[PDB]
Amino acid sequence: QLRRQHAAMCLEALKRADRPLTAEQVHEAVNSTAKPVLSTLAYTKKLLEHLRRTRFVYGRKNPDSMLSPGHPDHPRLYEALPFQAARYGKPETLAAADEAARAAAIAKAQKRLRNGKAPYPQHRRRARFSIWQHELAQEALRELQA
């Protein structure tokens, strides 16, 4: 619970200052809002890397201390994107990879059409609703309703 609270405070401090904000100032920014929290830089780095691995913040190079940015000793700049991303990379690079994958999907479908097969695999439509999901919806509606 404390780790959840500390990560939320690290995100809010990165959110209030919309500037690339490396580990040093995010540690100082979370500490300077009320030694209340974040006793060490290592704990703040562990929280920020976990937030980056869950696609809540991202990283960028640090000028004058680049040290090859994939080396884990490299200081990273944190930007704090507003919503949790569905993917991890730069959105322009993700869009380029999606276009390449979409063209590969068209090519595989065309090759499957020259052979005696369907373009895309045809699968039977299934039923996912049940008594448990209906009753779970009723419990959820009453829970928010109170």
Partner RNA sequence: UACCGUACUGCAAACCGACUCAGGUGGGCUAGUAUAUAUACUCAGGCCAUAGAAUCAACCAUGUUAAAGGAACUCGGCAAAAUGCACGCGUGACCUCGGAGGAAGCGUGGCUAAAAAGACUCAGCAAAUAGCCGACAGCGACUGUUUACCAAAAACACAGGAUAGU
Partner RNA sequence: CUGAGUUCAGACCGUCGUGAGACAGUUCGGUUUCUAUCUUUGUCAGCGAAAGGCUUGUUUUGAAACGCCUAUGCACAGUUAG
Partner RNA sequence: UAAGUUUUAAAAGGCUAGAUUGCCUACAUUCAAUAACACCGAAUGACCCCGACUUACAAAAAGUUUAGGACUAAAUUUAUGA
The residues binding RNA (CB under 7 A) are: 58-61, 66, 68-72, 79, 81, 85, 89-93, 121, 123-124, 126
**55 within 8 A of 86, measured Cβ to Cβ:** yes
Cβ of residue 52: shortest distance to RNA, in angstroms?
Answer: 7
Do the beta carbons of residue 112 and residue 118 sit within 8 Å?
yes
Amino acid occupying residue 129: F
Nearer to RNA, 131 or 146 (CB): 131
Q: How far is the CB of 57 from RNA (least distance, A)?
A: 9
Strand stretches in the chain, DSSP E? 21-22, 59-60, 77-78
- Minimum distance of RNA from residue 5's CB (angstroms): 25
Q: Edge-to-edge, what's the strand order for the sheet holding 59-60?
A: 21-22, 77-78, 59-60
**In the complex with RNA, which residue's Cβ is closer, 60 or 102?**
60
Between 107 and 140, name the residue whose CB sits nearer to RNA. Answer: 107
CB 9 within 8 A of CB 37: yes
Least CB distance from residue 45 to RNA, whole Å? 13
Measured from the CB atom, is 92 or 143 closer to RNA? 92
Helix%, strand%, coil% for the chain, nearest 5: 50, 5, 45
